[PDB]
């Protein structure tokens, strides 16, 4: 009687991505002895069986044994002039120069090896294997590329490499150590006041250490010195003590110091940071972190000699790639725009679709004319029209692009083309434009926000076109010509008598500009306001911050308006890095705009604050029209100036090589970097070797050794990490989460496959540092192959940025934006945060015996057990502070519902969120949600012990932090809107439109007053809990 006896006849009971890309083709793990077909100059294939982990020294030296039996020997030179070579899974013929490499790490396709002699006696150059390893594609794959844009980028972008490398040897070796160990420093020297108030009105207890022969021994020399003190002075007061005796006068001790003083610099104990320059000990992050955490710095006097004997020189050298028509100016062509649409092929659809047609529009991001569709013809079943557009050629703006698609009676396959060559040339001729499938849940008809260019997949709907030919090669005009036209149109302006511009007065409509100057990027501007703005453009120059709105007010399909804007922008005054970033989203494509934006960054963007926003800045490369461009030369330089940038710059590109829309642009960039970066290439290639071993191990677990209990999986885990190729590969390298940290020597004792079904690995290495005792002896992190990290990556970024906007507005909410890095297609590393457990783990550890209920006070009781005594108060504060900051951020970003298994509480009483899920309230808009709900459990801890906990004095002070913090973010809403906007490039399903980012606007309620915003907040915070939140 359950389903009205109705049968379901269909019901029979019966990543990314699949098995392959391992040690042999379609294999994963090659068995421990393998049969390898060897080939020679003879024609004589012997067939050595050999060990999977065996070096190529061996297989050679035991083939130059095993040959002396097989036929036609006597013609094989001293093996000392001979090299192996085979085909790899990325089908390339790879001469195997390094022969200390093991058979398993060759990434062969079939197990065979041809033998040969070394051609092109420049093995030394043919180690840009190392480059291809890092980049994850062969370098030769660039060499055989037709596009001159590419072969140029490669040859041209070496300017920057060379110029950067000379900047490193400018004051060798100090300069080299600034490159290799740049200071880790908050961007303002001034210290916030809640930090100050731990310091005896401006003093810190330090501890300098030193190792003198027999070295066995190490010696404290604890000081107490000013927070604003530089390291050079802290070197002195360290030596001062160590030196002082009853046999040194203060005259003789001053001389003894100054001489010993210069010879040393300060390291941090247990990890590789170095305070190498004039900055307050406070401005370094390790100190200001020690201050706050309740810790005594453990620095270390390192001899300069012994640091300088780590750094090797660059040895940078150019690669082998080292070696009219007049023109028609765009503006002379008397014509309109006509682009011919011929024939597509390959299109997938007869019965259910009625008809199909090629829709096209000209673009800037927004539309410069009535785009028009072509008549429908032979729908399905396999056009030839010159198609006429409503724009005069000369009005075409420089970043003008044709966007196209093929649509149904919904779309089918989209594409776009730059109307100009990277050489400022207007395109004429016939184009074959291979199309991209529509992104899942693109309901719009054309994709102009999409990437510029054809597909590199041949096997896709191609579409043939012809671009009007105007009797000659047509170029965009030089500034010389664009300037003149501005100054002409200006004086032609000054002489009519009628109302409308779209008058050297002023007024105080003057301030109805400044009103606009403060609105957020997504506050849509009205046509009247456009005309308002465009008309007073010459006044706007006293309010630079208005420029983004002005530029959106310009009519880019009038070359008149654009010529004049070009000239404003020429010597517009620099604006703040936080604003100029807006000017490199998809809404601003023009080269002069973007150039300006880059100058702003060259000028006023700290190596610190670049490091903070490096992810945005890299996603923005994608929206650039051409390969070479100012923003790349900018970032490539910074990357080569400052290894801590380069490091993440390299991972941030590498992580996205899988994604074939960027592949070439990024690979090519990565190649530039890997050639010029120096010895780091060797450290990266060790990181890269490691991550590959981890991916291939997790893959075996995920899709072969499923089930097999835990215990069988874990016997197979330890077996593998015992093997010598793994011990080689996973043991002496830098943490990509932070390469300051060194990993050395796996502790397999403590390595395990976490419980989750994506088989995350918990890895724990020794900390090889010489003073590891004072920091941590066991660095451990989580390698998770399965989930896509780059959303988590971002919310943690955003969370980090809030924490700063708080601190440096004096407002100590302590968030824990733990470390997370995407390093490939759904593959990453997540920092472990030691001594933390989930609220649900707390509920089991205090859960009284047989199962009835946990108890709401078990959390608050659990904290007392940790924080006993005078500390208790402090540990409640921490909870209360963190619990606020997370309550605000989580509401603001709209991240997925917090529950017991995704909140964590540390032993010291700090609370922090993990596994955030979708950020901007992605699919639950099918509203105004509060994802972190303060249950009783927390409320108790906040109101120490109280019953009827909603109305305590503690809880009101908690609400006060929330109100102050929410408003703090709101004041800086611009930044977040942009940070979000720049990330439209990355393929994140949570971010496809600006109207996605919408949510953050409702959330902060920018359209209302802040009175109304607060009260919006209070309301929503009241709505979530029912009780509390009325004032």
């Amino acid at each position: 009687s359950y389903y009205h006896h109705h049968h379901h006849h269909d019901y029979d009971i019966p990543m990314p991505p699949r098995p392959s890309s391992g040690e042999l083709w379609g294999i994963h793990l090659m068995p421990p002895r393998i049969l390898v077909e060897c080939l020679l100059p003879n024609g004589m294939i012997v067939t050595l069986e050999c060990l999977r982990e065996a070096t190529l020294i061996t297989i050679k030296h035991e083939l130059f044994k095993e040959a002396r039996k097989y036929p036609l020997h006597q013609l094989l030179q001293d093996e000392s002039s001979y090299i192996f070579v085979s085909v790899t899974q990325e089908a390339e013929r790879e001469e195997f120069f390094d022969e200390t490499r093991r058979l398993c790490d060759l990434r062969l396709f079939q197990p065979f090896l041809k033998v040969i002699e070394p051609v092109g006696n420049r093995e030394e150059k043919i180690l840009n294997r190392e480059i291809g390893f890092a980049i994850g594609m062969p370098v030769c794959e660039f060499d055989m590329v037709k596009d001159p844009e590419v072969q140029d980028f490669r040859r041209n972008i070496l300017n920057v490499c060379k110029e950067a490398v000379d900047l490193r040897d400018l004051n060798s070796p100090h300069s080299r150590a600034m490159y290799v160990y740049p200071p880790n420093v908050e961007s303002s020297p001034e210290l916030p006041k809640h930090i100050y108030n731990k310091l005896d009105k401006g003093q810190i207890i330090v501890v300098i250490w030193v190792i003198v022969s027999p070295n066995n021994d190490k010696q404290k020399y604890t000081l107490k010195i000013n927070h604003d003190c530089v390291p050079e002075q802290v070197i002195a007061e360290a030596i001062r003590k160590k030196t002082r005796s009853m046999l040194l006068s203060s005259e003789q001790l001053k001389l003894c110091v100054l001489e010993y003083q210069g010879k040393y610099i300060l390291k941090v104990c247990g990890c590789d940071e170095y305070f190498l320059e004039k900055y307050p000990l406070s401005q370094y992050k390790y100190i200001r972190s020690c201050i706050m955490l309740g810790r005594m710095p453990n620095l270390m006097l390192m001899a300069k000699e012994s640091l300088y004997s780590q750094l090797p020189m660059d040895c940078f050298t150019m690669p082998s790639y080292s070696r009219e028509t007049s023109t028609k100016s765009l503006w002379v062509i008397n014509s309109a725009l006509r682009i011919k649409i011929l024939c597509a092929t390959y299109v997938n659809v007869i019965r259910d679709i009625d008809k199909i047609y090629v829709r096209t529009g000209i673009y800037h991001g927004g539309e410069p004319l009535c785009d028009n569709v072509n008549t429908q013809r032979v729908p399905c079943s396999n056009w030839n029209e010159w198609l006429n557009y409503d724009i005069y050629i000369p009005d075409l703006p420089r970043a003008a692009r044709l966007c196209l698609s093929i649509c149904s009676v919904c779309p089918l396959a989209w594409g776009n083309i730059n109307l100009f060559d990277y050489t400022d040339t207007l395109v004429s001729g016939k184009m074959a434009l291979n199309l991209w499938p529509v992104p899942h849940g693109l309901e719009d008809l054309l994709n102009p926000i999409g990437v510029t260019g054809s597909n590199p997949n041949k096997e896709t709907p191609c579409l043939e076109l012809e671009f009007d030919w105007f009797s000659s090669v047509v170029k965009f005009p030089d500034m010389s010509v664009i300037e003149e036209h501005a100054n002409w149109s200006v004086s032609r302006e000054a002489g009519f008598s009628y109302s409308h511009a779209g008058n050297e007065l002023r007024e105080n409509d003057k301030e109805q500009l400044k009103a606009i100057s403060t609105r957020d990027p997504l506050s849509e501007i009205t046509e009247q306001e456009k005309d308002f703005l465009w008309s007073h453009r010459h006044y706007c120059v006293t309010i630079p911050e208005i420029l983004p709105k002005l530029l959106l007010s310009v009519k880019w399909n009038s070359r008149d308006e654009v010529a004049q804007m070009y000239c404003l922008v020429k010597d517009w005054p620099p604006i703040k890095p936080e604003q100029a970033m807006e000017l490199l989203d998809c809404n601003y494509p023009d080269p002069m705009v973007r150039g300006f934006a880059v100058r702003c960054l060259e000028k006023y963007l700290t190596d610190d604050k670049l490091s903070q926003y490096l992810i945005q800045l890299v996603q923005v490369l994608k929206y650039e029209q051409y390969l070479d461009n100012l923003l790349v030369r900018f970032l490539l330089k910074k990357a080569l100036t400052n290894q801590r940038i380069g490091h993440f710059f390299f991972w941030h590109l590498k992580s996205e090589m899988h994604n074939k829309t960027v592949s070439q642009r990024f690979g090519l960039l990565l190649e530039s970097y890997c050639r010029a970066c120096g010895m780091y290439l060797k450290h990266l290639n060790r990181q890269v070797e490691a991550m590959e071993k981890l991916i291939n191990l997790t893959d075996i677990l995920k899709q072969e050794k499923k089930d097999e209990t835990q215990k069988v999986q874990m016997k197979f885990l330890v077996e593998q990490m015992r093997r010598p190729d793994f011990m080689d590969a996973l043991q002496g390298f830098l943490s990509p989460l932070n390469p300051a940290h060194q990993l050395g020597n796996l502790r397999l004792e403590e390595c395990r496959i976490m419980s989750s079904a994506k088989r995350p690995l918990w890895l724990n290495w020794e900390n090889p540092d010489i003073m590891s005792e004072l920091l941590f002896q066991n660095n451990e992190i989580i390698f998770k192959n399965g989930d896509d990290l780059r959303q988590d990556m971002l919310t943690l970024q955003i969370i980090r940025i809030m924490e700063n906007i708080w601190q440096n507005q004096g407002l100590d909410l302590r968030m824990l934006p733990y470390g997370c890095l995407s390093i490939g297609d759904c593959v990453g590393l997540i920092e472990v945060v030691r001594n933390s457990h989930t609220i649900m783990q707390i509920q089991c550890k205090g859960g009284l015996k047989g199962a009835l209920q946990f108890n709401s006070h078990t959390l608050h009781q659990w904290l007392k057990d940790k924080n006993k005594g005078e500390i208790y108060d402090a540990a409640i504060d921490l909870f209360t502070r963190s619990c606020a900051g997370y309550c605000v951020a989580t509401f603001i970003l709209g991240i997925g519902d917090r529950h017991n298994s995704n909140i964590m509480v540390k032993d010291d009483g700090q609370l922090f969120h993990i596994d955030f899920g979708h950020f901007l309230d992605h699919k639950k808009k099918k509203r105004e949600r509060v994802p972190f709900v303060l249950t009783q459990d927390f409320l108790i801890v906040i109101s120490k012990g109280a019953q009827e906990c909603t109305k305590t004095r503690e809880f009101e002070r908690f609400q006060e932090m929330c109100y102050k913090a929410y408003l703090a973010i709101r004041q800086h809403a611009n930044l977040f809107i942009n940070l979000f906007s720049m990330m439209l490039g990355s393929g994140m399903p949570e971010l496809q439109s600006f109207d996605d980012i919408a949510y953050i606007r409702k959330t902060l309620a920018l359209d209302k007053t802040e009175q109304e915003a607060l009260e919006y907040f209070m309301k929503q915070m009241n709505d979530a809990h029912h009780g509390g939140w009325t004032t």
Binding site: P17, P71, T88, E92, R93, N348, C410, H440, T526
Partner: protein, 201 residues
Amino acid sequence: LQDEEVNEKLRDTTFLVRDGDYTLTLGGNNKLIKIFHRDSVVELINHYRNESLAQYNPKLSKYQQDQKLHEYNTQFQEKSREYDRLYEEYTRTSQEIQMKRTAIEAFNETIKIFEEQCQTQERYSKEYINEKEIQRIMHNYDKLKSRISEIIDSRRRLEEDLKKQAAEYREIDKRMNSIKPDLIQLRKTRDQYLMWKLNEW
């Protein structure tokens, strides 16, 4: 008169009535403007609609009609669920298809080394033509070509796996193109039955 969400819900087109204290969201793109009660109010509204508005650069709908139940959401969302799992099949297969092509590229190239090796023995078989050493030498050649046979036959097997995979691929893309417009109709007639909280389907 009375008898952000704009930019979201106005998905395509040319008239909209929001809330100067009100706002018009129509020409080109999705263009917006507003003035206070300055010159009639809601009868000059009827004018711009079809004629003039030449006091500006270019001069050039609501309510619900067209015929209450849950019904559609199980259709909509469990047709979506297929579209979604078809994006995944689509997705896998695409990555699978190139995985093959570049695995054929492996074969094609692998072979050329074994073709070059039959020929490296060809040269050295000719160059050194007792009748035992010749037979041993004749045998090692025999493996080459019976090995090469398998390599090529292996390639072919993949090559035809690629054809099925290609046809099977294209067919997923085919079936999604029927689902898209079907799936949009069902979302639009969901948002009209929204017009008429309570919810509970």
